[PDB]
Amino acid sequence: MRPSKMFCYQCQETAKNTGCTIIGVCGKKDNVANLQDLLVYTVKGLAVVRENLGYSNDKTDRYIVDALFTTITNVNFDDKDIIEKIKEGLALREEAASKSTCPGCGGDLPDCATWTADSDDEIIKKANSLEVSVLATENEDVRSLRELLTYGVKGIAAYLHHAMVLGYDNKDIHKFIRKALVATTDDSLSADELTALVLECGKYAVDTMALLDKANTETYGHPEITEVDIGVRNNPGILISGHDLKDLEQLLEQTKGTGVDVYTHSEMLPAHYYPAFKKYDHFVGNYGGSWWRQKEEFEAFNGPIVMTTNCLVPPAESYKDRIYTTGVVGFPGLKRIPEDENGNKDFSEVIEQAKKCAPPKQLETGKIVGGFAHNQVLALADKVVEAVKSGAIRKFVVMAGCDGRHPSREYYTEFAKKLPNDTVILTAGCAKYRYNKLGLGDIGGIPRVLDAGQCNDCYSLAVIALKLKEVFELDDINDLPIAFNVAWYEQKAVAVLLALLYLGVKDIVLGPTLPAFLSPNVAKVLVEKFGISGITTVDEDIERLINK
Numbered sequence: 001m002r003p004s005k006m007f008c009y010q011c012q013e014t015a016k017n018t019g020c021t022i023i024g025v026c027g028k029k030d031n032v033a034n035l036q037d038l039l040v041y042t043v044k045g046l047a048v049v050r051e052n053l054g055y056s057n058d059k060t061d062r063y064i065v066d067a068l069f070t071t072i073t074n075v076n077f078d079d080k081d082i083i084e085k086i087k088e089g090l091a092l093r094e095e096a097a098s099k100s101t102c103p104g105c106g107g108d109l110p111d112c113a114t115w116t117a118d119s120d121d122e123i124i125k126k127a128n129s130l131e132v133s134v135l136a137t138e139n140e141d142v143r144s145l146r147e148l149l150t151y152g153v154k155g156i157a158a159y160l161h162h163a164m165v166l167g168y169d170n171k172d173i174h175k176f177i178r179k180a181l182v183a184t185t186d187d188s189l190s191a192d193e194l195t196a197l198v199l200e201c202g203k204y205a206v207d208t209m210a211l212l213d214k215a216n217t218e219t220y221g222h223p224e225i226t227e228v229d230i231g232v233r234n235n236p237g238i239l240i241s242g243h244d245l246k247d248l249e250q251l252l253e254q255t256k257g258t259g260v261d262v263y264t265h266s267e268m269l270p271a272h273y274y275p276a277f278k279k280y281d282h283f284v285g286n287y288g289g290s291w292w293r294q295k296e297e298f299e300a301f302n303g304p305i306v307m308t309t310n311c312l313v314p315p316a317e318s319y320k321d322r323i324y325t326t327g328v329v330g331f332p333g334l335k336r337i338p339e340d341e342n343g344n345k346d347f348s349e350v351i352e353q354a355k356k357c358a359p360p361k362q363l364e365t366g367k368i369v370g371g372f373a374h375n376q377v378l379a380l381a382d383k384v385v386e387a388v389k390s391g392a393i394r395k396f397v398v399m400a401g402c403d404g405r406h407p408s409r410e411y412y413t414e415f416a417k418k419l420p421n422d423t424v425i426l427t428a429g430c431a432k433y434r435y436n437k438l439g440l441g442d443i444g445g446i447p448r449v450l451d452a453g454q455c456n457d458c459y460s461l462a463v464i465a466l467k468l469k470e471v472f473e474l475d476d477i478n479d480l481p482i483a484f485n486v487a488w489y490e491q492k493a494v495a496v497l498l499a500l501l502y503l504g505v506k507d508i509v510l511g512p513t514l515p516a517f518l519s520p521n522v523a524k525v526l527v528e529k530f531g532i533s534g535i536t537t538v539d540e541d542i543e544r545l546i547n548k
């Protein structure tokens with residue numbers, strides 16, 4: 001018997017930092033949360049069956065990453081979509097089971113690999129069962145490690161999805177996803193074995209971020225130094241949000257010559273840094289701030305909005321008629337832009353709607369500079385190294401990650417403003433919006449905020465650090481003049497954290513709170529072995545991270 005209507009604690013904003021049990025803080029309703037649990041459960045069973053067969057296939061690999069992405073915070077609020085995804089997994093699982101060479105193994109299989117439902121009512125009943133809840137794992141340390149691994153796997157799945165959209169893949173990462181999912185169903189594993197899998201999850205997060213970096217840069221060019229306008233023009237626009245650059249490619253192609261401008265929002269900002277998008281005259285600039293302001297900013301934008309990934313907030317009535325979903329995003333009543341047989345998407349109706357809209361309300365004017373991904377920073381290596389050797393740059397501070405609504409996040413704005421003028425902030429992901437419009441200036445022409453791109457472009461920050469480690473002949477990445485004060489919100493940030501731990505980064509400050517899914521004993525290991533700490537006050541953290 002489920003002790004509460006739902007249980008979800010996978011993001012930074014979980015209620016009281018102990019768990020959403022009646023309705024999600026994000027707006028995810030109990031029935032949706034329980035259906036998402038059943039979707040994860042169904043994916044775990046599908047992984048068990050594929051591991052029994054000994055191999056997977058492309059349609060199953062894509063399904064598994066897409067189904068996991070469907071359950072990431074702020075992606076899909078639509079119970080109908082989640083039910084359809086559950087049924088798709090059951091059909092793929094039954095297909096796989098029909099190809100089994102050892103079907104006598106059925107009775108030894110965990111329930112997630114064999115459960116069935118003969119009706120939508122039986123699906124809902126199963127979704128409401130205790131066995132599909134996150135709380136089904138009874139020991140709190142085993143639960144903590146399984147959930148941490150699972151959320152790291154969701155983050156891998158999101159980034160892998162984007163690589164696959166662009167025609168890139170790595171079947172070893174999919175093999176790891178299945179292995180990890182199976183492990184969370186395996187009561188024979190010890191906590192040490194789960195701990196090893198969490199570390200291996202960081203290794204595969206590096207590999208996945210490397211693959212997505214290859215996909216984005218081979219397709220659209222290497223990011224380069226770019227000034228991005230944050231004001232508006234006088235034409236109707238379409239605002240594109242989330243992370244998917246292929247969606248933008250098609251939107252820009254289809255709006256060329258139409259009189260409809262295109263603007264980016266939140267994690268679409270880094271598209272401006274890629275040469276393939278810079279080429280379009282009607283690609284205007286970046287509108288507003290990070291995802292949590294979107295109810296106000298999407299209304300002010302006046303034109304249609306295309307949400308390619310998270311973060312989607314349950315929309316205000318004022319713009320519900322002009323916000324569209326795509327990819328795995330969903331919300332009841334929002335129309336979707338589906339892929340055709342080739343993965344092409346048709347924005348014609350969004351464009352015809354945009355022609356009838358007022359132009360965007362100006363929220364601000366000016367320009368921000370960005371595009372300091374790994375190729376661009378490597379081209380500046382002599383200048384960066386010279387600034388380090390002279391002490392013009394005494395310390396880099398990685399403040400990358402993912403913003404959110406909690407006002408405690410003011411810490412990051414105040415921290416950025418109080419840093420001394422001989423430090424440089426390295427950023428990526430929407431955490432940047434706490435400090436990327438502050439006018440912090442430059443050090444000998446190197447901006448004091450260096451934006452490498454989306455949260456996945458934390459990969460570039462790791463590559464830059466590893467290059468500086470090589471240049472300075474250090475044998476420990478932590479011997480660089482670098483500090484980490486990272487903000488997190490959902491599961492892609494968890495995968496980024498694990499990647500950093502796997503790469504050997506110690507003493508990360510993680511905030512503005514520590515995840516609810518760390519049990520006391522698990523958090524103890526992160527503190528004592530990896531040096532993780534939470535934020536305190538700006539002055540104390542400036543002192544410990546910068547001046548000592």
Ligand code: SF4
Binds near residue numbers: 010
């Ligand atoms: S995704 Fe976050 S806010 Fe939403 S229900 Fe889960 S823990 Fe709560």
Ligand SMILES: [Mg+2]
Binds near residue numbers: 078079080332
């Ligand atoms: Mg519905």
